[PDB]
Structure 1
Amino acid sequence: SYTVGTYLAERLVQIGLKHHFAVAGDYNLVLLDNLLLNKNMEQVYCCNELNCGFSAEGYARAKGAAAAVVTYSVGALSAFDAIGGAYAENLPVILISGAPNNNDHAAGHVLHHALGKTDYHYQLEMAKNITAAAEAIYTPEEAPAKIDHVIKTALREKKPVYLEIACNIASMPCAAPGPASALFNDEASDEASLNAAVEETLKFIANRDKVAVLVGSKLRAAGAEEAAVKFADALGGAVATMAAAKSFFPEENPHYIGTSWGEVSYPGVEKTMKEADAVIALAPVFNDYSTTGWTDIPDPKKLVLAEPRSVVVNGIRFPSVHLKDYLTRLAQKVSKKTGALDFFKSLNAGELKKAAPADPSAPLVNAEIARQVEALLTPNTTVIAETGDSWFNAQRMKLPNGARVEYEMQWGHIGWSVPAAFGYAVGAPERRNILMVGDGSFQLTAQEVAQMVRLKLPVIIFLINNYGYTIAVMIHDGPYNNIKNWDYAGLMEVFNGNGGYDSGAGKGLKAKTGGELAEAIKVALANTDGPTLIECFIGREDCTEELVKWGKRVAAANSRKPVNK
């Protein structure tokens, strides 16, 4: 039969989870015990609750959904930062929090781990601000509906949700869960709306032969990646990805012209976007970063805006239309509109200029690092790129079909990448998992590398030691951009603890030249029993020219003076 804990466990298993992440606390131990009863799913422990949140976030990037289990108050509050991130990056992370004994409610009881008042709903009220659904379970009878509600909502909305469970009811009997299919049940497109949206689009591009497609960072959340490819092949138009949509469209496809990102776009892309008479944006996010300081905004008179669940085209809004249906039907009706792609080719702007192989003995530079990492890409590779110049190194890489890049470009939490890489590697252990992270970001969440060691995850970490917050240096410089330098390579043996209670097979290596990097990479690819950190030493001013151009824009936008109102 079922308890509150094993009901939740079963639902998690039904939406496809093979792992859930947890930090033990006295308010969730019984719950953890009940989750553990389901041998179809593994309990993975993290160091702190922030890393736990980002671990699940990364896991959801690999498997589509995730779960994090923390304790009441002291656990959940730091996790909220990760949950906020999951929301911003449209990932269904289910955050489960232990909660006080339900006898301690409306009793006038001060409780440990809480604020010192007799109020026990402040955590729920906080969570409401950063989740698609949030529920507290204080009795077993209400458990099944609340669990089903939040899990259904997360999958439908592609947003994180919140659950708290009284510690003394986690083992209480409750109803059994029905079929898994009920959890994914969602409304189909309104047929009439779907047909009118497609027809309006054909009317719009009837005498606009220069059609460009702009791939956006919500395309995976809409499950519309495959459909985008059918539509593009049918259209024969020019296809560019927004920066945060890297790898959301096959780069070996003949219609792909590269990255669209204002003045830091691939060669010929900015001109082509300007020359197109119609722009079809598939699930874009336009914010201050993606529009390069509000300098690159799509011409509203040319824009066909196709969101996950609605289309605006030809001055008409069509709610209740799923992007994948709209793309699939459109791909069946559309004729060739090659004008944009023909214009792009007529530019002869050439491929992205990339640096030649560096002299192996010469001092290591950022370009030489990017070159060697790119050479590691395969159809089975995933690169995790941290906020920082790593954003731009990654954007410059040509991806073979199948290879993935993971960005956190809406939330932008430095340190996200380390736990996110951990969780991703747990979720997709069969892939070659590469983490590109700067020294500054790495310090926020570095202990999660020890969990990589613990689970023998062969993550390859390229640690860019440029000695400071360089991306911040290119926005606005000051003494707050300086940090304490670590011996990052030596940190691996610390996490191994060889000679201690347990063991580890992680390796840490330093690279000061192109030759030393190449040797380290060879060692990394041979390490199958643990992660390999490659500490790369480069100058502080040595970064992509993209970062410098983009940095000026961002700084000017942020700092622009108030307008009288």
Structure 2
Amino acid sequence: SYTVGTYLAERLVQIGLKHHFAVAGDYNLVLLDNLLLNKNMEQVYCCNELNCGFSAEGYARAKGAAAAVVTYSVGALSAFDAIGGAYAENLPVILISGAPNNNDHAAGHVLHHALGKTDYHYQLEMAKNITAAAEAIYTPEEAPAKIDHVIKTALREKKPVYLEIACNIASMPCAAPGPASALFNDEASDEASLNAAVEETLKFIANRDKVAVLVGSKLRAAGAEEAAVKFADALGGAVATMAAAKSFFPEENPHYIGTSWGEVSYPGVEKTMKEADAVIALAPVFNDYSTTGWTDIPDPKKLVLAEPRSVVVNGIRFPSVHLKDYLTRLAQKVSKKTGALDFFKSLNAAAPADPSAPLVNAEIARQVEALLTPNTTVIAETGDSWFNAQRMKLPNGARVEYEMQWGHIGWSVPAAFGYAVGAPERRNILMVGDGSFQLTAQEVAQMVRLKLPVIIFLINNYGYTIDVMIHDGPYNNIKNWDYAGLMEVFNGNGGYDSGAGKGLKAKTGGELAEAIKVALANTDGPTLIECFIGREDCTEELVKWGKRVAAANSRKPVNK
């Protein structure tokens, strides 16, 4: 029948996973063995556990959920960083750690990979801090309930969870997994609440014709993107996206006005939000970065707060209401409120050089924007890449992935890898700076391994420019690499296996243009285009936003 391992494998398959990512270790080899018995899933290996985790995170952006398997302690602790990331970004990533032989608890035993103490619950306890659920499986009999609990929890809450599994029980017999349908079983919206929430919104915007819709970075987590479009079309008001919510709303929609992000919003959008009589925020995340150093806070007395599972409106809080239902209902009964849109229309709100000239930041953004199609996904790394990506016009169906809540530089590399494994057919573009690329560069080797065509724009401006614009110092300088040259190293052509990765250098617009052509044709492996630009040549947005962030960060203690 089933084992602890094959039970887990079946559950992962049942949730939609076609892959899981792993780094082998003696505490998880038998588990990995068991996972391999499943004929509906592949096992994908990574260089290290940080990357293994971010790879699952990128996979979950593509598939909805993901799984990573590491070894006890030496494997798990670094992965925890990625799991914290998955919590911050609302992605159900399942981390499974190998664990000690069950006989080793309360035994006076010191084990390898651990602290040198005799107890082994510290990993589990750390994990509880950064997950929606965390369970330790010490016996075969308890496996089914714990796996089911953590999986159901991850799916309902759109958050990562933790499982550890004693290495000697991986092949032990246990109960069979029931229907996949049970795993997705959530509660329906409380009818009385949904109705009142809608009625209060209609009452709220009855004498407020200037209605704006603020799209938030939790919109996808709530699976209410489609619903948001219906409402917007019915409302006929202006729709703005928060920076992190880019591509969560169709930009070719006639109601879309661009990015809201304080002083660095799209032209006119900032004024449009302050003129709005009502702001209906759809699954928003308000933090020090999205508010631009706290300079852009929404007015509470005109804000409708439509979170993924609750709605606050007209001074009443309505829990137990799914955003998708809320939006669908409101769409059907809402009247036209086009005031904010008309206003924006009435508003009245870099300079290119030739391809035979030193490459500049604005020329890169342009050529990348020209590559965008409804089948494209852009992975935007923390750095100026955030701002360049944000300024691009997205054809309906084009996606952009941001990690603006966690903001772990280096994320974009293994994430692009994981995402590509999950969406091989898409045009996958990775926009990443040299600074970030160095933390996790090696995962590009796995793109080479799996023959994943990923187009990598490596922005070599020789250091951490985004930090240069927040607060400069010697700590913003790095060792430059021959980034284009790394690809052949990863190919290893000359050793054993093989690789069709390509590394190109771009020092002018013409070169970048040719390099891009080569990248598009290279569908056999990734293509890294090393773009050379100046440290100071960044978006104007970064410079302004950076000053706000720096001011926010350093503001003096307030007497308590």
TM-score (norm 1): 0.99
Report the Cα offset of residue 360 of structure 1: 0.9
Cα offsets for 1:45-72 (capped at 9, x unmatched): 0000000000000000000000000000
Q: Work out the CA distance in 2 between the residues paired with 1:529 and 1:255.
A: 40
- 1:127-142 pair list within 5 angstroms: 127-142=127-142
**Equivalent residues of 2:352, 2:362 under 8 A apart:** no
The answer on 1:62 being equivalent to 2:57 is no
1:194 aligned residue: 194
User: Distance in 2 between the 1:358 and 1:233 partners?
Assistant: 40
Q: Measure how far apart 1:356 and its partner are.
A: 5.5
Task: Please list the CA deviations of residues 445-473 of structure 1 after superposition, one character each: whole Å capped at 9, or x if unmatched.
Answer: 00000000000000000000000010000
What is the CA-CA distance between 1:152 and the residue it aligns to? 0.2
Secondary structure in 2 matching 1:177: coil
Decide whether the 8 Å contact of 1:357 with 1:371 is kept in 2. no
Asked if the contact 2:58/2:419 (under 8 Å) is kept, the reply is yes
CA distance in 1, matches of 2:432, 2:39: 34
Task: Report if the CA contact (8 A) 1:422-1:449 is conserved.
Answer: yes
For 1:271 and 1:530, how far apart are their aligned partners in 2? 45
Contact 1:88 1:411 in 2 (8 A): yes
CA distance in 2, matches of 1:358, 1:421: 31
Match of 1:53 in 2: 53
Distance between the aligned counterparts of 1:284 and 1:528, measured in 2? 37
Residue by residue over 1:4-41, the C-alpha shift from the partner in whole angstroms, topping out at 9 and shown as x without a partner, is: 00000000000000000000000000000000000210
Q: Structure 1, residues 475-505: CA drift from partner, whole Å, max 9, x if none?
A: 0000000000000000000000111111110
Distance of 1:392 and 1:563 partners within structure 2: 32
Q: 1:230-288 deviations in whole A, cap 9, x for unaligned?
A: 00000000000000000000000000000000000011101110101000000000000
Query: In structure 1, what is the Cα distance between the partners aligned to 2:201 and 2:405?
Result: 29
The CA deviation string for residues 196-229 of structure 1, in whole angstroms up to 9 with x for no partner, is 0000000000000100000000000000000000
> What do residues 338-394 of structure 1 show as CA deviations (whole Å, max 9, x unaligned)?
000011111132xxxxx4653011000000000000000000000000000000000
In structure 1, distance between residues paired with 2:500 and 2:207: 62
Quote the Cα distance in structure 2 between the aligned partners of 1:39 and 1:46: 21
| Residues 193, 321 of structure 1: 8 Å contact kept | yes
Distance in 1 (CA, whole Å) between partners of 2:341 and 2:348 is: 12
Q: Does the Cα contact within 8 Å between 2:283 and 2:305 map onto a contact in 1?
A: yes
Shift of 1:528: 1.2
The count of residues paired between Structure 1 and Structure 2 equals 560
Tell me which residue corresponds to 1:550. 545
> In structure 2, how many angstroms separate the alpha carbons of the residues matched to 1:200 and 1:264?
33
- Kept in 1, the 8 Å contact 2:220–2:248? The answer is yes
Q: CA contact under 8 A between 1:429 and 1:457: conserved in structure 2? A: yes
State the 1:121 CA deviation.
Answer: 0.2
Provide the rounded CA distance (Å) in 1 between the counterparts of 2:472 and 2:346. 42
Shift of 1:523: 0.5
Q: Answer yes or no: is 1:457 the counterpart of 2:483.
A: no
SS at match of 1:240: strand
CA distance in 2 between partners of 1:243 and 1:356 (Å) = 24
* Matched-pair contact (CA < 8 Å) for 2:356–2:508: yes
CA distance in 2, matches of 1:346, 1:112: 68
* 3-state SS in 1 of match to 2:280: strand
Q: Could you tell me which residue of structure 1 aligns to residue 344 of structure 2?
A: 344
Rounded to whole Å, the distance in 2 between the matches of 1:109 and 1:249 is 55
Deviations 1:122-155 (A, max 9, x none): 0000000000000000000000000000000000
Q: Whole-Å Cα distance in 2 between the matches of residues 4 and 412 of structure 1? A: 35
Give 3-state SS (helix, strand or coil) of 1:154's partner.
Answer: helix
State the secondary structure of the residue aligned to 1:130. Answer: coil
Q: Give distance in 1, aligned partners of 2:317 and 2:524.
A: 54
CA deviations 1:406-457 (Å, max 9, x no partner) are 0000000000000000000000001000000000000000000000000000
1:242 corresponds to which residue? 242
Q: How is 1:239-388 mapped onto 2 (pairs within 5 angstroms)? A: 239-349=239-349, 355=350, 357-388=352-383
Query: How much does 1:520 deviate?
Result: 0.3
Aligned to 1:162, what secondary structure does the other structure show? strand
Q: Would the aligned equivalents of 1:57 and 1:66 in 2 still touch at CA under 8 Å?
A: yes
Are the aligned partners of 2:463 and 2:477 in contact in 1 as well (CA < 8 Å)?
A: yes
Instruction: Give a deviation string over 1:271-330, Cα, whole Å, max 9, x none.
Output: 110101000000000000000000000000000000001010011100000100000000
CA distance in 2, matches of 1:514, 1:113: 50
Secondary structure in 2 matching 1:347: coil
What SS does structure 2 have at the residue aligned with 1:343?
helix
1:499-558: per-residue Cα shift (whole Å, max 9, x none)?
111111000000000000001001001101100000000000000000000000000000
1:206 partner SS: coil
| Paired residue secondary structure (2:331) | helix
CA distance, structure 1, for counterparts of residue 214 and residue 264 of structure 2: 15
Mapped to 1, the partners of 2:357 and 2:114 lie a distance apart of 57
Residues 1:116 and 2:116 are matched in the alignment:
yes
* Structure 2 partner of 1:517: 512
Secondary structure at the counterpart of residue 129 of structure 2 = helix
Cα separation, 2, equivalents of 1:72 and 1:414: 25
Q: Secondary structure at the match of 1:39?
A: coil
SS class of match (2:301) = coil
**Cα separation, 1, equivalents of 2:353 and 2:376:** 24
2:241–2:259 CA contact under 8 A, matched in 1: yes
Aligned 8 A contact 1:83 1:95 in 2 = yes
Rounded to whole Å, the distance in 2 between the matches of 1:358 and 1:219 is 39
Shift in Å, 1:105 = 1.0
User: Whole-Å Cα distance in 2 between the matches of residues 259 and 73 of structure 1?
Assistant: 42
Q: Secondary structure at the match of 1:55?
A: helix
Match of 1:536, SS?
A: strand
Contact residue 132 and residue 160 of structure 1 kept, 8 A: yes
Gaps of 5+ in 2: none
Mapped contact 1:280–1:303 kept (Cα < 8 A): yes
Distance, in Å, in 2 between the alignment partners of 1:499 and 1:110 is: 44
**Consecutive unaligned residues in structure 1, runs of 5 or more:** 350-354
- 2:533 corresponds in structure 1 to 538
1:338 & 1:100 partners in 2: Cα distance?
62
- Whole-angstrom CA distance in 2 between matches of 1:178 and 1:210: 51
Q: What is the distance in 2 between the residues matched to 1:198 and 1:89?
A: 28
Distance in 1, matches of 2:351 and 2:554, equals 38
Contact 1:54 1:420 in 2 (8 A): yes
Q: Is the 8 A contact 2:240 2:256 kept in 1?
A: yes
Q: Secondary structure at the match of 1:68?
A: strand
Q: Distance in 1 between matches of 2:525 and 2:344?
A: 45
The TM-score normalised by the length of structure 2 is: 1.00
Structure-2 separation of matches of 1:112 and 1:345: 66
Using the alignment, how far apart are the partners of 2:271 and 2:471 within structure 1? 30
Query: How far, CA to CA, are the matches of 2:252 and 2:117 in structure 1?
Result: 60
Alpha-carbon distance between aligned partners in 1 of 2:179 and 2:158, rounded to the nearest angstrom: 21
Partners of 1:21 and 1:46 within 8 A in 2: yes
Q: Are 1:490 and 2:480 matched, yes or no?
A: no
State the secondary structure of the residue aligned to 2:304. Answer: strand
- Aligned-partner Cα distance in 1 for 2:335–2:318: 22
